[PDB]
Amino acid sequence: GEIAQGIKEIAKGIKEIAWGIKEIAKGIKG
Amino acid sequence: GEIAQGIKEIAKGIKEIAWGIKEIAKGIKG
Amino acid sequence: GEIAQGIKEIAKGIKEIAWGIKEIAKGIKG
Amino acid sequence: GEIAQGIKEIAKGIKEIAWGIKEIAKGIKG
Amino acid sequence: GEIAQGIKEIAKGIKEIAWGIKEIAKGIK
Amino acid sequence: GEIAQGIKEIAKGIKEIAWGIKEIAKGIKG
Amino acid sequence: GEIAQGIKEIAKGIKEIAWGIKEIAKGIK
């Protein structure tokens, strides 16, 4: 259960990186 | 099943990062 | 236990990357 | 099989990130 | 034990990436 | 064996990201 | 053993990313 929870927290962090990269792409296009 | 679901969510986030990086590459090349 | 702890430490580092990427996006946006 | 498939999808997305990063390096060198 | 050690070495490297990214954000600012 | 192969494919893609990041560093330093 | 070896190769690649990101931060600075 602690392994499944760690993996889910990785997935959450990866989604937050994807959001940040999209914000960089928008900044560059500005 | 929760481990397989976490790994699939990581894969989804990584694909969204790939899309964002490609958008940055296109923005810079503009 | 050591595997679950290592995975949690990966998740912590990935969150720190997400914060850094957000700070880059803010810098680019001015 | 679902775990092996998720891991393979992570590998595919990571290779797509590598391609994008190489295109950023090309854009900067322009 | 070799798997746990490899995972811990990934964690260490990811933290060092985080520090570098923060330094980029400071450089841009 | 399918899990070991997926992990090795992730390792390959991570090395290709490392190469691209180094090419960015060289581009900027130019 | 093949799983432990793959994880160790990921750790090596992550450390090389960390080095590259540090070089970017130095370049911007």
Residue numbers in the entry:
A (entry chain E), B (entry chain A), C (entry chain F), D (entry chain B), F (entry chain D): 1 to 30
E (entry chain G), G (entry chain C): 1 to 29
Sentences from the paper on this structure:
Expanding this pattern to hpphhph can produce larger α-helical barrels. Here, we show that pentameric to nonameric barrels are accessed by varying the residue at one of the h sites. In peptides with four L/I–K–E–I–A–x–Z repeats, decreasing the size of Z from threonine to serine to alanine to glycine gives progressively larger oligomers. X-ray crystal structures of the resulting α-helical barrels rationalize this: side chains at Z point directly into the helical interfaces, and smaller residues allow closer helix contacts and larger assemblies.
Conversely, both Gly variants scored more favourably as larger oligomeric states: the a = d = Ile variant as an octamer; and a = Leu, d = Ile as a nonamer. The Gly@g variant with a = d = Ile unfolded at 38 °C and did not fully refold on cooling. Indeed, peptide sequences with a = d = Ile are more unstable than their a = Leu, d = Ile counterparts. Thus, β-branched Ile at both a and d maintains the open assembly even with Gly residues at g. Although a larger oligomer was predicted in silico, the calculated internal energies for Gly@g were similar for the different oligomers. The hexameric and heptameric assemblies of CC-Type2-(GgIaId)4 imply that, whilst Gly@g is necessary to access larger states, it is not the only factor that dictates oligomer state of the helical assembly.
